[PDB]
Amino acid sequence: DAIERQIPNFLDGMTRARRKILAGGVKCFASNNRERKVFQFGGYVADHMFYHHGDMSLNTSIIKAAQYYPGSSHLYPVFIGIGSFGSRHLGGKDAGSPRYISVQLASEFIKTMFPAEDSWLLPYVFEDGQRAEPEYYVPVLPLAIMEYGANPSEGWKYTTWARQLEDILALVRAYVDKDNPKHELLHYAIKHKITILPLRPSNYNFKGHLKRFGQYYYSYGTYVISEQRNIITITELPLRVPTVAYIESIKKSSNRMTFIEEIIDYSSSETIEILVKLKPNSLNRIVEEFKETEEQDSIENFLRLRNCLHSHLNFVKPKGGIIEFNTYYEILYAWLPYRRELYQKRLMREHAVLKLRIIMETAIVRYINESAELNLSHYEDEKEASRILSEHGFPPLNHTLIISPEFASIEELNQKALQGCYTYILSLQARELLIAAKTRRVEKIKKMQARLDKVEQLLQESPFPGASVWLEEIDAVEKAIIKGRNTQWKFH
Amino acid sequence: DAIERQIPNFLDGMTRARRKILAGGVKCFASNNRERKVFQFGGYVADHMFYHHGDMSLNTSIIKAAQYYPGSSHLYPVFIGIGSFGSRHLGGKDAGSPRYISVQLASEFIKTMFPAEDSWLLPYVFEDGQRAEPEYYVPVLPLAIMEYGANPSEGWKYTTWARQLEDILALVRAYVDKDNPKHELLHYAIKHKITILPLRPSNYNFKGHLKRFGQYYYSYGTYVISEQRNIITITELPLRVPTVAYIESIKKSSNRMTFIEEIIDYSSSETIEILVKLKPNSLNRIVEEFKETEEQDSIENFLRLRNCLHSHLNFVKPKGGIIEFNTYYEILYAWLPYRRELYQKRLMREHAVLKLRIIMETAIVRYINESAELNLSHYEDEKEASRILSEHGFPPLNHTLIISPEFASIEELNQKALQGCYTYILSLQARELLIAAKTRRVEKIKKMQARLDKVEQLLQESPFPGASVWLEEIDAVEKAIIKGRNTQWKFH
Structure with missing residues (x-):
């Protein structure tokens, strides 16, 4: 738990x-x-x-x-x-x-x-x-x-x-679209469980940088030196360390406080801006003390603006x-097929619902056509009307599930929607047998059949169903994140 | 104002x-x-x-x-x-x-x-x-x-x-019912503006009494004398004087305080019970002082338990x-004809509404019968259906006033209820033409016609309309007041 x-x-x-x-x-x-x-x-x-x-x-x-x-x-x-x-x-x-x-x-x-x-x-x-x-x-x-x-x-x-953002954009647009040159090469890679594409950590609103050493990545911030005023200006930090915790961590080490004179905080969460005045002969004696290597200089050892990004x-x-x-590649591998299966279930359910809507509306307009032959205003039982409308070809419909097909499996959608009362034909007094309603219901049947044919096209999409839908949706998410981040979550 | x-x-x-x-x-x-x-x-x-x-x-x-x-x-x-x-x-x-x-x-x-x-x-x-x-x-x-x-x-x-209560009961049951022997004698009296029947003030929960002198009544309360203890017990007051105001009014007159010793208040609004101990030789010196007359004795002059009921x-x-x-008789005279006219307007309005309901329900069942001949499912306009249903005898109905006939004069009730759309025939799809509904609507027409005949009987009631209704209603008011008074407005 x-x-x-x-x-x-x-x-x-x-x-x-x-x-x-x-x-x-x-x-x-x-x-x-x-x-x-x-x-x-x-x-x-x-x-x-x-x-x-x-x-x-x-x-x-x-x-x-x-x-x-x-x-x-x-x-x-x-x-x-x-x-x-x-x-x-x-x-x-x-x-x-x-x-x-x-x-x-x-x-x-x-x-x-x-x-x-x-x-x-x-x-x-x-x-x-x-x-x-x-x-x-x-x-x-x-x-x-x-x-x-x-x-x-x-x-x-x-x-x-x-x-990053566009690394995952490239990975997923690669896995979907066959207009990628690397498309089947990506399928080759996933089949062989090998890594082929750059998968970099973020860079948004962080002006430091990264390198790889061994397996790890090290992140560096920035500094400005001026021994004229003997002040270092810190402008960049490692990844996600607060300002006050950093300044207090600088004031922790008395070994380094041997040259730390004055720490002034001009920073904000908007801008990191720290001005540190040091003693005379600070940097040279730091070089005499701190062993300057490749992985950090005297300043990067002193101010400690690097980070090992263990995960x-x-x-x-x-x-x-x-x-x-173990890797991010494993995570993307696991992420793909569930979304694929979701699109499959999506369009299969929509196909079932379009079946049932076209069936019901055809049966309705058939009754509107057979208003003349039936004319059954010499009946007094409703089950009488059930049996006689079962004579002239009108199917049992559970229209409750038909209008709203909530939450079901597709099999129960086709089973128990066809087992209901004929009340949709029926309810009240006269005038809905007039043919303008018939005409607009026919217009509805035409649009539903065209939408059904578009569905049956998209059932057969290469290499998996609904892939063009998912390209459109990633296009929409691209529009959304552009509209968000390029307005920085104001939406105005 | x-x-x-x-x-x-x-x-x-x-x-x-x-x-x-x-x-x-x-x-x-x-x-x-x-x-x-x-x-x-x-x-x-x-x-x-x-x-x-x-x-x-x-x-x-x-x-x-x-x-x-x-x-x-x-x-x-x-x-x-x-x-x-x-x-x-x-x-x-x-x-x-x-x-x-x-x-x-x-x-x-x-x-x-x-x-x-x-x-x-x-x-x-x-x-x-x-x-x-x-x-x-x-x-x-x-x-x-x-x-x-x-x-x-x-x-x-x-x-x-x-x-009283039953005086007005007798007056109004006399004015309505012709089974009164005094019925036409009461009409003789009202025609000649004379007073023939007793018209007494109330007696409920007032154990004092009344007499007439000149034009007025005087009301008297009660007292109990005991010169053993030299205490008078007041148990009854005049009409609607509070207890504390009475005792303070007794303590007003220092002329009478010359023998007033002790006033003890055992009373409530439930029961009036006042015990007044007086000085020795009070009553005899009161007789020597207060002139005992017919209209008040020495006690009724002293305690002042009488009242002139001016109006x-x-x-x-x-x-x-x-x-x-000038009199109560003038008030009863003015009261009668407005209630009479109200019954007249009442049953005339009910007659108009029963007309319009029988008209609408006959037109409806006529359409249910003519479902076969019309069968007009080859139309596309509603005004087309209006004109063709105006062919085969179906009247223009403003059914809004028909269902609820609010607040109107009877003439506007018959005018503007017949000037509306035919939507009562119409609004939805079909099944109400099934004839069990037709049967129950016929049952409704039968009860409405029987009620209409009862109305047309009661239009001609002697000597003014609706009089038996008013006898029934006075019977109900009698039931209500007796039920309340036996329960003291607890109704339990």
Whole structure:
């Protein structure tokens, strides 16, 4: 449980509670995207999705999911937050109060990242006989290794250093489109379990850099030296270390305080800007003391602006169970076929529903045509009308499932929708036998048949079904992340 | 306006505000008889009925209308009250707090005293473009001189000493029923403006008595003498004087305090019980001082337990205006013909509505029969269906007024209900042509025609219409008042 909550799935990078937060949010702001306050939304959550814990951790994790700061664990804010949600400069955890700040669901992104139609398709866990969360979402991108995580967690320290964006764009556009030259070469690679394409950590809003040594990567920040004023200007840090913790860590080592004179903090979470005046003969005696090597100079040994980016990637598979990984390539391998199978189930279900709609509307317009021959206004039993409408060719229909085909398997969709009462022909007094309604129902049958033929085309798409849909959806997610990040999560 | 508010109508004995109170109460407790508190009900009043004053006088008059004490101005509680609404012993005005006591509408009486069906029939005053109160109610009894009123009011001191109950029962059962031997003799009397029947003031829960001198009655209370203890026990008062005001009025006259020793108050509003010990040789020296006459003895001069019942009866006629009276007989004369005219309008309106219902349901079952000949499923316009259903004999019906005939004159009821669309035949798909519905609609036509024949009988009732209805309704009011008085407005 504790391991099951604090180590995420390889499909979400999120807890069960985080998925509950998102599910309740989609349930909330669907009709109207007006910003709530935090506690109203939290009460909505704890009522609806059965948030099984206390509201302190609820409001905590909600504002954690609203942490929009450079170097957060979210490159993608789930919620547009209005207020004051934190600062990396002051350790990150300096948000506002749960009475002032406003959360709002960023549905203009979430409709694209999460397939809104396929929300029905997901294997839910209907506990307590009631509507509960996805067992796992499925995103358009593989989101579960696109964002950082650095926490004391169960079993292992949870550590997900990020990747790039366009590397995964290239990988997935490669795996889908056959217009890749490397397309079957990628299938060759996946078949042979070999790595062929660059898979680089993130670079967004981080002006330091990386190298590889051994297997590890080392990250470096920047500095400016001026022995005129005898001041070093620090402008760049390693990956996700707060400002105050760094300055206090500099004031830890009395061995290095032997030349540390004056530390002035001009920084913010917006801009890192630290001015450090040192003693006379600082740098030369540092060179005399600190062994300057290739991996760090005297300044990189002194100020300690490098980081070894060790990782821990041992996630939780669906249908119960923990799957333990070694590379990011394993994660992308595991991520692909579930999305493929989801598109397959998607278009098969849509094909079944289009079958049943065309069947029902044909039977209806057939009755409108046979208004003359039937004319059965000398009957007094409804089951009499059932039997006589079973004479002249009208099929038993359970139109309740026909109008809304909720949550079912495709087999039960075709079985138990055809076993109902004929009330759709029937209800009330006269005038709907008039032919203008007949005409518009025929127009509906024509559009449904054209859509059915488009479905039956896309059933046979190479090399797996629905691939052009997924190219369109990655195009939409590209539009979404461009609109978001290039406006930096303002959406205005 | 102040005269218009503080002098009532001769049909209500109530203010415009009191009629607003009753109207909002019927509007409130209609669906459910679950009691409010006072302030919720007052807010319901001030919102709905446009209560044109402040809530202090509102809660004041509401608890005034919940005053159930022997010697109130209400023999008939409009509202069942739960709490503690006052005491005659302490001057009457010692109610509870407006946020802890409960009012409840006594609809089981009010349905009988106020004709619930004829609530539609009343000439309303629809000001501000919206729903407002009756100009005047009409009760089954002449309520407006059945209950006391003793107040400093505009123009005159408002004074309505009560009558009996069964005197007015005899008067009105005489005016209606021709099985009275005095029936045409009463018509002789009303034609000749003479008084023929006893018209006595109230006696309920007043063990004193009355006599006539000149024109007035004088009312006498009781006393018990014991010169053993030299104590007089007062058990009965005059009509509606509080206990503490009486004892203080006894302690006013120092001329009589020359023998007043000790006044002990064992009384309540339930029971009057006052023990007065006097000085030795009180009564004999009182006889030596007070001139014992016929109209009062030495005790009735001393304790002053008599009352001259002067009156002021100058009420406010409807359609504007003040009508000024001389006798109760004038009031009963004015009261009769309006209720007569109300029954006439009542049964004429019901006759019009039964006409229109039988017309519509005959046209409907005619269409159900002519389903075969029409079969007009080869049309595409609704006005086409209008014209072709105007061919085969189906009348234009404004069914909106037909289903609910609100608030209209009978002429507009027959004019503008026949000028509408044929949508009652029409609006949806088919199955209501199945003839069990036809059968039950025929059953409806049969009961409507039988009820129409009963109406056309009662149109010709001697000597004025609806008189047997009014005998039934006075029987119901008799049942209600006996049921209440045996239960003391507890109704349990």
